[PDB]
mmCIF file of C-alpha atoms and ligand atoms in Angstrom:
data_model
loop_
_atom_site.group_PDB
_atom_site.id
_atom_site.type_symbol
_atom_site.label_atom_id
_atom_site.label_comp_id
_atom_site.label_asym_id
_atom_site.label_seq_id
_atom_site.Cartn_x
_atom_site.Cartn_y
_atom_site.Cartn_z
ATOM 1 C CA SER A 22 -22.798 9.193 16.452
ATOM 2 C CA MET A 23 -21.443 5.767 15.323
ATOM 3 C CA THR A 24 -22.327 4.871 11.661
ATOM 4 C CA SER A 25 -21.902 1.723 9.429
ATOM 5 C CA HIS A 26 -19.898 3.746 6.795
ATOM 6 C CA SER A 27 -19.068 7.050 5.042
ATOM 7 C CA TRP A 28 -17.724 8.166 1.599
ATOM 8 C CA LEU A 29 -14.286 9.594 0.650
ATOM 9 C CA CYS A 30 -12.931 10.742 -2.742
ATOM 10 C CA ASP A 31 -16.119 12.931 -3.082
ATOM 11 C CA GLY A 32 -18.428 9.833 -2.909
ATOM 12 C CA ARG A 33 -16.264 7.512 -5.140
ATOM 13 C CA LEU A 34 -14.662 5.499 -2.178
ATOM 14 C CA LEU A 35 -16.555 3.375 0.422
ATOM 15 C CA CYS A 36 -15.158 3.686 4.039
ATOM 16 C CA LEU A 37 -16.531 0.943 6.384
ATOM 17 C CA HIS A 38 -16.184 1.942 10.117
ATOM 18 C CA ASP A 39 -16.555 -1.431 11.941
ATOM 19 C CA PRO A 40 -13.924 -3.990 10.737
ATOM 20 C CA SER A 41 -15.650 -7.114 12.283
ATOM 21 C CA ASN A 42 -19.366 -6.415 11.465
ATOM 22 C CA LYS A 43 -20.956 -9.544 9.808
ATOM 23 C CA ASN A 44 -23.133 -7.145 7.628
ATOM 24 C CA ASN A 45 -20.128 -5.383 5.876
ATOM 25 C CA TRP A 46 -20.530 -7.641 2.724
ATOM 26 C CA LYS A 47 -24.038 -6.110 2.118
ATOM 27 C CA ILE A 48 -22.361 -2.651 1.427
ATOM 28 C CA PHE A 49 -18.874 -3.894 0.244
ATOM 29 C CA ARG A 50 -19.939 -6.132 -2.683
ATOM 30 C CA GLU A 51 -21.668 -3.609 -5.081
ATOM 31 C CA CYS A 52 -18.593 -1.226 -4.861
ATOM 32 C CA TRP A 53 -16.259 -4.231 -5.369
ATOM 33 C CA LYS A 54 -18.208 -5.601 -8.404
ATOM 34 C CA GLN A 55 -17.733 -2.130 -10.077
ATOM 35 C CA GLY A 56 -13.874 -2.409 -9.808
ATOM 36 C CA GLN A 57 -13.535 0.200 -6.935
ATOM 37 C CA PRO A 58 -10.969 -0.005 -4.113
ATOM 38 C CA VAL A 59 -12.507 0.031 -0.578
ATOM 39 C CA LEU A 60 -11.152 1.355 2.813
ATOM 40 C CA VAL A 61 -11.938 -0.271 6.218
ATOM 41 C CA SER A 62 -10.894 1.739 9.338
ATOM 42 C CA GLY A 63 -10.257 0.645 12.977
ATOM 43 C CA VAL A 64 -8.324 -2.684 12.480
ATOM 44 C CA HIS A 65 -5.543 -1.476 14.957
ATOM 45 C CA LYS A 66 -8.127 -1.619 17.848
ATOM 46 C CA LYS A 67 -8.529 -5.441 17.163
ATOM 47 C CA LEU A 68 -4.741 -6.256 17.181
ATOM 48 C CA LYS A 69 -2.315 -6.972 20.095
ATOM 49 C CA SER A 70 -0.380 -3.667 19.757
ATOM 50 C CA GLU A 71 2.823 -5.042 21.540
ATOM 51 C CA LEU A 72 3.326 -7.564 18.633
ATOM 52 C CA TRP A 73 3.648 -4.743 15.974
ATOM 53 C CA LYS A 74 6.377 -2.434 17.487
ATOM 54 C CA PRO A 75 9.708 -1.840 15.673
ATOM 55 C CA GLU A 76 11.722 -2.324 18.942
ATOM 56 C CA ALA A 77 10.287 -5.919 19.250
ATOM 57 C CA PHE A 78 11.191 -6.785 15.598
ATOM 58 C CA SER A 79 14.812 -5.543 16.279
ATOM 59 C CA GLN A 80 15.126 -7.473 19.621
ATOM 60 C CA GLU A 81 13.712 -10.786 18.168
ATOM 61 C CA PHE A 82 15.129 -10.851 14.581
ATOM 62 C CA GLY A 83 17.935 -8.225 14.565
ATOM 63 C CA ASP A 84 20.776 -10.688 13.619
ATOM 64 C CA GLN A 85 19.172 -11.771 10.248
ATOM 65 C CA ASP A 86 20.944 -10.658 6.991
ATOM 66 C CA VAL A 87 18.861 -8.517 4.498
ATOM 67 C CA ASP A 88 19.138 -6.036 1.625
ATOM 68 C CA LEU A 89 17.659 -2.475 1.786
ATOM 69 C CA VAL A 90 16.808 0.042 -1.007
ATOM 70 C CA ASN A 91 17.659 3.764 -0.921
ATOM 71 C CA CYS A 92 14.192 5.243 -1.908
ATOM 72 C CA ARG A 93 15.740 8.529 -3.269
ATOM 73 C CA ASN A 94 17.899 6.831 -6.025
ATOM 74 C CA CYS A 95 16.939 3.039 -6.042
ATOM 75 C CA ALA A 96 20.509 1.919 -5.007
ATOM 76 C CA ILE A 97 20.623 -1.507 -3.210
ATOM 77 C CA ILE A 98 22.423 -1.751 0.184
ATOM 78 C CA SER A 99 23.489 -5.467 0.183
ATOM 79 C CA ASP A 100 23.966 -7.879 3.109
ATOM 80 C CA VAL A 101 23.368 -5.787 6.284
ATOM 81 C CA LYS A 102 21.779 -6.779 9.639
ATOM 82 C CA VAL A 103 17.981 -6.177 9.865
ATOM 83 C CA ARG A 104 18.664 -4.308 13.213
ATOM 84 C CA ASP A 105 20.491 -1.566 11.095
ATOM 85 C CA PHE A 106 17.018 -0.851 9.498
ATOM 86 C CA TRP A 107 14.785 -1.215 12.630
ATOM 87 C CA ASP A 108 16.966 0.871 15.084
ATOM 88 C CA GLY A 109 16.692 3.931 12.696
ATOM 89 C CA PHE A 110 12.888 3.478 12.073
ATOM 90 C CA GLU A 111 11.896 6.437 14.358
ATOM 91 C CA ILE A 112 15.270 7.839 15.594
ATOM 92 C CA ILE A 113 16.809 9.849 12.742
ATOM 93 C CA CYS A 114 20.302 10.114 14.422
ATOM 94 C CA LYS A 115 20.629 6.285 14.196
ATOM 95 C CA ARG A 116 19.899 6.035 10.399
ATOM 96 C CA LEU A 117 22.498 4.902 7.814
ATOM 97 C CA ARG A 118 23.912 7.958 5.956
ATOM 98 C CA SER A 119 24.571 8.495 2.190
ATOM 99 C CA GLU A 120 27.939 10.065 0.989
ATOM 100 C CA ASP A 121 26.330 13.577 1.117
ATOM 101 C CA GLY A 122 26.096 12.885 4.908
ATOM 102 C CA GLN A 123 22.216 12.981 4.982
ATOM 103 C CA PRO A 124 20.236 10.224 6.776
ATOM 104 C CA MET A 125 18.783 7.851 4.059
ATOM 105 C CA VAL A 126 15.083 7.057 3.420
ATOM 106 C CA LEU A 127 15.234 3.200 3.379
ATOM 107 C CA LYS A 128 12.903 0.342 2.443
ATOM 108 C CA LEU A 129 13.496 -3.187 3.881
ATOM 109 C CA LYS A 130 13.386 -5.515 0.782
ATOM 110 C CA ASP A 131 11.557 -8.947 0.938
ATOM 111 C CA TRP A 132 11.345 -9.467 4.787
ATOM 112 C CA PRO A 133 10.255 -11.934 6.042
ATOM 113 C CA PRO A 134 11.519 -13.541 2.786
ATOM 114 C CA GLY A 135 9.247 -15.366 0.237
ATOM 115 C CA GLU A 136 6.435 -17.281 2.053
ATOM 116 C CA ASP A 137 8.268 -17.515 5.453
ATOM 117 C CA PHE A 138 6.050 -14.976 7.409
ATOM 118 C CA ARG A 139 3.933 -17.781 9.042
ATOM 119 C CA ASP A 140 6.990 -19.932 10.096
ATOM 120 C CA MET A 141 9.113 -16.989 11.354
ATOM 121 C CA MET A 142 6.217 -15.132 13.184
ATOM 122 C CA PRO A 143 3.373 -17.589 14.098
ATOM 123 C CA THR A 144 1.836 -15.330 16.852
ATOM 124 C CA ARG A 145 1.780 -12.254 14.419
ATOM 125 C CA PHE A 146 0.249 -14.502 11.711
ATOM 126 C CA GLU A 147 -2.569 -15.561 14.108
ATOM 127 C CA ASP A 148 -3.226 -11.915 15.321
ATOM 128 C CA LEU A 149 -3.470 -10.576 11.708
ATOM 129 C CA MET A 150 -5.398 -13.456 9.969
ATOM 130 C CA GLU A 151 -8.047 -13.594 12.830
ATOM 131 C CA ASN A 152 -8.789 -9.803 12.479
ATOM 132 C CA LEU A 153 -8.858 -9.267 8.644
ATOM 133 C CA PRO A 154 -12.099 -7.534 7.541
ATOM 134 C CA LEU A 155 -14.471 -9.185 4.931
ATOM 135 C CA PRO A 156 -13.232 -12.654 6.080
ATOM 136 C CA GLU A 157 -15.299 -14.719 3.497
ATOM 137 C CA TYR A 158 -13.129 -12.906 0.853
ATOM 138 C CA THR A 159 -9.783 -12.554 2.745
ATOM 139 C CA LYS A 160 -9.249 -15.810 4.814
ATOM 140 C CA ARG A 161 -7.228 -18.578 3.004
ATOM 141 C CA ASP A 162 -10.345 -20.855 3.251
ATOM 142 C CA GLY A 163 -13.110 -18.158 3.080
ATOM 143 C CA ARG A 164 -16.156 -19.198 0.965
ATOM 144 C CA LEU A 165 -15.606 -16.313 -1.588
ATOM 145 C CA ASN A 166 -11.810 -16.815 -1.881
ATOM 146 C CA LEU A 167 -11.186 -19.030 -4.979
ATOM 147 C CA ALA A 168 -7.319 -19.092 -4.393
ATOM 148 C CA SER A 169 -7.307 -22.725 -3.173
ATOM 149 C CA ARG A 170 -10.072 -23.861 -5.647
ATOM 150 C CA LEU A 171 -8.683 -22.894 -9.136
ATOM 151 C CA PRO A 172 -6.959 -25.056 -11.772
ATOM 152 C CA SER A 173 -3.548 -24.237 -13.406
ATOM 153 C CA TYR A 174 -5.407 -22.280 -16.136
ATOM 154 C CA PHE A 175 -5.363 -19.457 -13.425
ATOM 155 C CA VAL A 176 -2.295 -17.707 -11.852
ATOM 156 C CA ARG A 177 -2.600 -18.562 -8.131
ATOM 157 C CA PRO A 178 -1.209 -16.160 -5.453
ATOM 158 C CA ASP A 179 1.745 -17.250 -3.160
ATOM 159 C CA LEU A 180 0.944 -18.078 0.517
ATOM 160 C CA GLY A 181 1.050 -14.777 2.508
ATOM 161 C CA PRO A 182 0.899 -12.536 4.299
ATOM 162 C CA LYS A 183 3.826 -10.251 3.202
ATOM 163 C CA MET A 184 5.249 -7.454 5.380
ATOM 164 C CA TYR A 185 6.156 -4.019 3.834
ATOM 165 C CA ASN A 186 8.507 -1.867 6.000
ATOM 166 C CA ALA A 187 9.943 1.518 4.941
ATOM 167 C CA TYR A 188 10.892 4.974 6.326
ATOM 168 C CA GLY A 189 8.802 8.121 5.515
ATOM 169 C CA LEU A 190 9.781 10.408 2.627
ATOM 170 C CA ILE A 191 10.853 13.814 4.040
ATOM 171 C CA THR A 192 11.881 16.692 1.669
ATOM 172 C CA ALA A 193 10.163 18.728 -1.128
ATOM 173 C CA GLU A 194 12.297 16.725 -3.658
ATOM 174 C CA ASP A 195 11.103 13.446 -1.982
ATOM 175 C CA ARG A 196 7.482 14.402 -3.114
ATOM 176 C CA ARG A 197 8.327 13.132 -6.699
ATOM 177 C CA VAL A 198 9.526 9.621 -5.585
ATOM 178 C CA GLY A 199 7.597 6.456 -4.497
ATOM 179 C CA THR A 200 8.048 3.958 -1.669
ATOM 180 C CA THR A 201 6.502 1.446 -4.127
ATOM 181 C CA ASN A 202 6.426 2.361 -7.871
ATOM 182 C CA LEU A 203 3.309 2.055 -10.096
ATOM 183 C CA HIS A 204 2.498 -1.665 -10.820
ATOM 184 C CA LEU A 205 -0.492 -4.103 -10.932
ATOM 185 C CA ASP A 206 -1.174 -7.564 -9.401
ATOM 186 C CA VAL A 207 -3.289 -10.363 -11.006
ATOM 187 C CA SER A 208 -4.895 -11.214 -7.586
ATOM 188 C CA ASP A 209 -6.963 -9.042 -5.174
ATOM 189 C CA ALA A 210 -5.161 -7.813 -1.959
ATOM 190 C CA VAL A 211 -5.974 -6.298 1.457
ATOM 191 C CA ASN A 212 -3.144 -4.081 2.903
ATOM 192 C CA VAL A 213 -3.361 -3.251 6.708
ATOM 193 C CA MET A 214 -1.394 -0.374 8.384
ATOM 194 C CA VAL A 215 -0.349 -2.020 11.747
ATOM 195 C CA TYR A 216 2.159 0.720 12.881
ATOM 196 C CA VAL A 217 3.011 4.365 11.998
ATOM 197 C CA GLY A 218 6.290 5.756 13.448
ATOM 198 C CA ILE A 219 6.485 9.574 13.683
ATOM 199 C CA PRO A 220 10.241 10.311 14.042
ATOM 200 C CA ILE A 221 12.323 12.561 16.402
ATOM 201 C CA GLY A 222 15.602 14.584 16.129
ATOM 202 C CA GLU A 223 14.413 16.116 12.825
ATOM 203 C CA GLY A 224 11.040 16.159 14.685
ATOM 204 C CA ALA A 225 8.728 19.121 13.808
ATOM 205 C CA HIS A 226 8.150 17.925 10.196
ATOM 206 C CA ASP A 227 4.313 18.281 10.256
ATOM 207 C CA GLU A 228 3.955 20.856 7.404
ATOM 208 C CA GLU A 229 5.689 19.089 4.426
ATOM 209 C CA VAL A 230 3.335 16.081 5.212
ATOM 210 C CA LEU A 231 0.293 18.446 4.708
ATOM 211 C CA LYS A 232 1.680 19.914 1.434
ATOM 212 C CA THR A 233 2.291 16.299 0.172
ATOM 213 C CA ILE A 234 -1.349 15.253 0.967
ATOM 214 C CA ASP A 235 -2.627 18.541 -0.607
ATOM 215 C CA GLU A 236 -0.511 18.214 -3.828
ATOM 216 C CA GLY A 237 -1.464 14.455 -3.801
ATOM 217 C CA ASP A 238 -5.065 15.592 -4.554
ATOM 218 C CA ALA A 239 -6.568 14.257 -1.223
ATOM 219 C CA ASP A 240 -10.257 15.213 -0.546
ATOM 220 C CA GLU A 241 -11.417 17.699 2.197
ATOM 221 C CA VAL A 242 -13.072 14.903 4.334
ATOM 222 C CA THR A 243 -9.671 12.989 4.385
ATOM 223 C CA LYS A 244 -7.915 16.243 5.522
ATOM 224 C CA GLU A 245 -10.496 16.547 8.418
ATOM 225 C CA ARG A 246 -9.259 13.101 9.870
ATOM 226 C CA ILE A 247 -5.946 14.861 10.788
ATOM 227 C CA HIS A 248 -7.198 18.357 11.884
ATOM 228 C CA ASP A 249 -10.374 17.196 13.782
ATOM 229 C CA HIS A 250 -9.667 13.534 15.006
ATOM 230 C CA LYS A 251 -5.801 13.612 15.306
ATOM 231 C CA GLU A 252 -5.385 10.155 13.555
ATOM 232 C CA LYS A 253 -1.799 9.170 12.425
ATOM 233 C CA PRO A 254 -1.360 9.254 8.580
ATOM 234 C CA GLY A 255 1.005 6.531 7.209
ATOM 235 C CA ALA A 256 0.953 6.494 3.379
ATOM 236 C CA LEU A 257 -0.479 8.291 0.278
ATOM 237 C CA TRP A 258 -1.797 5.833 -2.390
ATOM 238 C CA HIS A 259 -2.904 6.479 -6.007
ATOM 239 C CA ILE A 260 -5.074 3.642 -7.444
ATOM 240 C CA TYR A 261 -6.487 3.445 -11.047
ATOM 241 C CA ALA A 262 -9.308 1.261 -12.428
ATOM 242 C CA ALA A 263 -8.126 -1.965 -14.233
ATOM 243 C CA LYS A 264 -9.945 -0.737 -17.383
ATOM 244 C CA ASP A 265 -7.553 2.345 -17.536
ATOM 245 C CA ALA A 266 -4.233 0.281 -17.499
ATOM 246 C CA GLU A 267 -3.574 0.509 -21.330
ATOM 247 C CA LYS A 268 -4.167 4.340 -21.338
ATOM 248 C CA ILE A 269 -1.594 4.591 -18.497
ATOM 249 C CA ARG A 270 0.826 2.399 -20.589
ATOM 250 C CA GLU A 271 0.348 4.884 -23.527
ATOM 251 C CA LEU A 272 1.208 7.955 -21.350
ATOM 252 C CA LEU A 273 4.396 6.306 -19.956
ATOM 253 C CA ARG A 274 5.576 5.175 -23.455
ATOM 254 C CA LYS A 275 5.207 8.836 -24.645
ATOM 255 C CA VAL A 276 7.020 10.247 -21.547
ATOM 256 C CA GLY A 277 9.745 7.505 -21.785
ATOM 257 C CA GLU A 278 10.368 8.743 -25.424
ATOM 258 C CA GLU A 279 10.361 12.477 -24.469
ATOM 259 C CA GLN A 280 12.997 11.584 -21.781
ATOM 260 C CA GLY A 281 15.177 9.810 -24.424
ATOM 261 C CA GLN A 282 14.586 6.222 -23.187
ATOM 262 C CA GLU A 283 14.934 3.838 -26.215
ATOM 263 C CA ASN A 284 12.032 1.346 -25.785
ATOM 264 C CA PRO A 285 10.252 -0.993 -28.308
ATOM 265 C CA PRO A 286 6.654 0.221 -29.025
ATOM 266 C CA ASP A 287 5.069 -2.792 -27.186
ATOM 267 C CA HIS A 288 7.147 -2.729 -23.906
ATOM 268 C CA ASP A 289 5.154 -2.608 -20.583
ATOM 269 C CA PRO A 290 6.038 0.439 -18.369
ATOM 270 C CA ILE A 291 3.577 -0.786 -15.627
ATOM 271 C CA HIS A 292 5.179 -4.323 -15.426
ATOM 272 C CA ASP A 293 8.671 -2.615 -15.349
ATOM 273 C CA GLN A 294 7.653 -1.016 -11.984
ATOM 274 C CA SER A 295 10.033 1.886 -12.816
ATOM 275 C CA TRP A 296 7.559 4.911 -12.705
ATOM 276 C CA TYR A 297 6.051 7.055 -9.886
ATOM 277 C CA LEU A 298 3.210 9.373 -11.123
ATOM 278 C CA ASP A 299 4.020 12.779 -9.493
ATOM 279 C CA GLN A 300 1.639 15.841 -9.586
ATOM 280 C CA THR A 301 2.767 16.673 -13.209
ATOM 281 C CA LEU A 302 2.223 13.133 -14.594
ATOM 282 C CA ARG A 303 -1.160 12.717 -12.765
ATOM 283 C CA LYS A 304 -2.461 16.039 -14.254
ATOM 284 C CA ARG A 305 -1.262 14.948 -17.779
ATOM 285 C CA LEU A 306 -2.958 11.512 -17.337
ATOM 286 C CA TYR A 307 -6.248 13.405 -16.541
ATOM 287 C CA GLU A 308 -5.980 16.215 -19.207
ATOM 288 C CA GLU A 309 -4.551 14.175 -22.195
ATOM 289 C CA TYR A 310 -6.076 10.637 -21.609
ATOM 290 C CA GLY A 311 -9.220 11.397 -19.574
ATOM 291 C CA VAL A 312 -8.154 9.074 -16.680
ATOM 292 C CA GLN A 313 -9.009 9.906 -13.010
ATOM 293 C CA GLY A 314 -7.711 7.851 -10.013
ATOM 294 C CA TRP A 315 -8.429 7.525 -6.267
ATOM 295 C CA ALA A 316 -6.009 9.443 -3.961
ATOM 296 C CA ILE A 317 -6.154 7.554 -0.612
ATOM 297 C CA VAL A 318 -4.453 8.433 2.700
ATOM 298 C CA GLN A 319 -3.985 5.153 4.712
ATOM 299 C CA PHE A 320 -4.012 6.010 8.506
ATOM 300 C CA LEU A 321 -2.990 3.631 11.393
ATOM 301 C CA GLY A 322 -5.427 0.654 11.341
ATOM 302 C CA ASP A 323 -6.837 1.380 7.831
ATOM 303 C CA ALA A 324 -7.197 -1.669 5.504
ATOM 304 C CA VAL A 325 -6.947 -0.807 1.751
ATOM 305 C CA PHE A 326 -8.677 -3.325 -0.629
ATOM 306 C CA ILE A 327 -6.905 -3.261 -4.087
ATOM 307 C CA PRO A 328 -8.832 -4.831 -7.013
ATOM 308 C CA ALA A 329 -6.999 -7.313 -9.367
ATOM 309 C CA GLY A 330 -5.565 -5.534 -12.431
ATOM 310 C CA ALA A 331 -5.771 -2.049 -10.776
ATOM 311 C CA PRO A 332 -2.492 -0.067 -11.274
ATOM 312 C CA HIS A 333 -1.328 1.419 -7.880
ATOM 313 C CA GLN A 334 1.631 3.275 -6.234
ATOM 314 C CA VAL A 335 2.469 4.020 -2.540
ATOM 315 C CA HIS A 336 4.326 7.031 -0.957
ATOM 316 C CA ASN A 337 5.067 6.724 2.840
ATOM 317 C CA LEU A 338 4.408 10.019 4.725
ATOM 318 C CA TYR A 339 5.906 8.602 7.956
ATOM 319 C CA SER A 340 7.662 5.286 8.807
ATOM 320 C CA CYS A 341 5.186 2.432 8.146
ATOM 321 C CA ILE A 342 4.720 -1.300 8.919
ATOM 322 C CA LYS A 343 2.109 -2.733 6.466
ATOM 323 C CA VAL A 344 0.923 -6.387 6.243
ATOM 324 C CA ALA A 345 -0.888 -7.519 3.043
ATOM 325 C CA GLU A 346 -2.728 -10.776 2.070
ATOM 326 C CA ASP A 347 -3.631 -11.797 -1.521
ATOM 327 C CA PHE A 348 -7.053 -13.434 -2.390
ATOM 328 C CA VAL A 349 -9.096 -14.296 -5.583
ATOM 329 C CA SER A 350 -12.685 -12.917 -5.468
ATOM 330 C CA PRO A 351 -15.190 -14.285 -7.998
ATOM 331 C CA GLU A 352 -15.823 -10.633 -9.077
ATOM 332 C CA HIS A 353 -12.239 -10.320 -10.498
ATOM 333 C CA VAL A 354 -11.073 -13.932 -11.326
ATOM 334 C CA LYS A 355 -10.958 -12.937 -15.060
ATOM 335 C CA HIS A 356 -7.741 -10.912 -14.280
ATOM 336 C CA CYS A 357 -5.681 -14.139 -13.403
ATOM 337 C CA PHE A 358 -6.985 -16.416 -16.309
ATOM 338 C CA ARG A 359 -4.106 -17.587 -18.635
ATOM 339 C CA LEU A 360 -6.095 -17.595 -21.952
ATOM 340 C CA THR A 361 -7.655 -14.977 -24.363
HETATM 341 C C1 S64 B 1 -22.345 -3.025 7.636
HETATM 342 O O1 S64 B 1 -23.416 -2.952 8.581
HETATM 343 C C2 S64 B 1 -23.149 -2.354 9.819
HETATM 344 C C3 S64 B 1 -24.245 -2.280 10.754
HETATM 345 C C4 S64 B 1 -24.066 -1.700 11.975
HETATM 346 C C5 S64 B 1 -22.835 -1.179 12.346
HETATM 347 C C6 S64 B 1 -22.648 -0.530 13.725
HETATM 348 N N1 S64 B 1 -21.262 -1.000 14.671
HETATM 349 C C7 S64 B 1 -21.165 -0.417 16.195
HETATM 350 C C8 S64 B 1 -22.306 0.818 16.619
HETATM 351 C C9 S64 B 1 -23.486 0.872 15.918
HETATM 352 S S1 S64 B 1 -24.400 2.045 16.092
HETATM 353 C C10 S64 B 1 -25.048 2.450 14.436
HETATM 354 C C11 S64 B 1 -24.507 1.091 13.441
HETATM 355 C C12 S64 B 1 -23.222 0.685 14.048
HETATM 356 C C13 S64 B 1 -21.723 -1.242 11.423
HETATM 357 C C14 S64 B 1 -21.896 -1.833 10.188
HETATM 358 CL CL1 CL B 2 -12.582 -5.742 -13.077
HETATM 359 CL CL1 CL B 3 5.503 -14.249 16.334
HETATM 360 CL CL1 CL B 4 -17.321 -11.305 4.447
HETATM 361 CL CL1 CL B 5 9.021 -0.390 -6.260
HETATM 362 MN MN1 MN B 6 1.097 -4.383 -4.918
#
């Protein structure tokens, strides 16, 4: 039967089932006030699916110049055509190759660039902004979004949305690397999975995806979304409570020292955005510092709500298109204040 919601992460994560229900705030707001992330499923069924295909992005924008990152080693590939990224999104035999002759796992850096999403893609902007869940929080002018209402004493978010495009990580060695490294934002954000590309050529790659989710510490109910409902998994997230940020900084200073980095005792490993917490570092964070996170698998059409100040990292299981919007909820406005 259809239900308002369910629980993931053994009861620690709210999952709302109906992205447009006017009642969602009645369940959403107690979880949000406690500093928890929230998941909303089914946003893909509200969107115009033809606007979110990699082939259309290549056809319409393919001649623009961009940089890419190699996700395996962080090397920058400077000044290539955006079609060189899109045409390899799902077809492995079209991907740029590293010197070892392997196809590369690539991330498209800063595209569309800065605040230009709305100007470059006005029909995509309309389709997304009209279908965001919890609209009193997430719309630029929503009644519970203080972004446009705050003085300079607060760090205000840039005009969004922002698009995040990257290939899926593939091998056993790829399990220890991030698509986006551990970091925190001073605003709240909603991140929507608008497209998941399951590739072909090296197509039969279903089992390393399961071992990644398993080793990622995903709950049994999350694993049933694959096996029972056949939904498409895009990305594995780890998110940590804002209150646990300094304990995470202490772990990464200790590990940085063990690994022979030479770092002043006050430097900020989270702001550096240079770490991915693999199975080993997550277990150590738990055992030695008493810190537990939320392991979240974001499927096609899932919206992930990330609280201000919450450290988080992202690991693409397949090729993903994500679109994110920043907002300032009254619950978390303390995290963007410029004094004390
Ligand atoms: C947050 O409050 C909510 C209230 C009701 C819903 C429903 N959406 C479509 C189908 C029905 S059947 C049972 C309740 C369902 C969802 C959320
Ligand atoms: Cl908080
Ligand atoms: Cl458009
Ligand atoms: Cl709302
Ligand atoms: Cl990163
Ligand atoms: Mn972020």
